[PDB]
Amino acid sequence: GGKWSKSSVIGWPAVRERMRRAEPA
């Protein structure tokens, strides 16, 4: 998805995977 937001694209998975935990609704 473009070699720009790459890093974000790679941290978001961790953010979602963090938030899921906190509120998995």
Interior angle at CA 20, CA 16 and CA 25, nearest 5 = 130
Dihedral class, residue 2 (left if φ above 0, else alpha if ψ from -120 to 50, else beta): left
For residue 19, which amino acid is it? M
Q: Domain locations in the chain?
A: 1-25
- Distance, in Å, from the CA atom of 18 to the CA atom of 7, rounded to the nearest integer, reads 17
1 contact partners, CB below 8 Å, separation of at least 6: 9
CA-to-CA distance for 17 and 23, rounded, in angstroms? 10
CA distance linking residue 2 with residue 9, whole number of Å:
10
Give the residue carrying structure tokens 């790459």: 6
Element (H, E) at 18: helix 6-22
Do residues 1 and 9 lie in contact, with contact meaning Cβ atoms separated by under 8 Å?
yes
d(CA 25, CA 8): 23
Residue entry with tokens 């938030």: 19
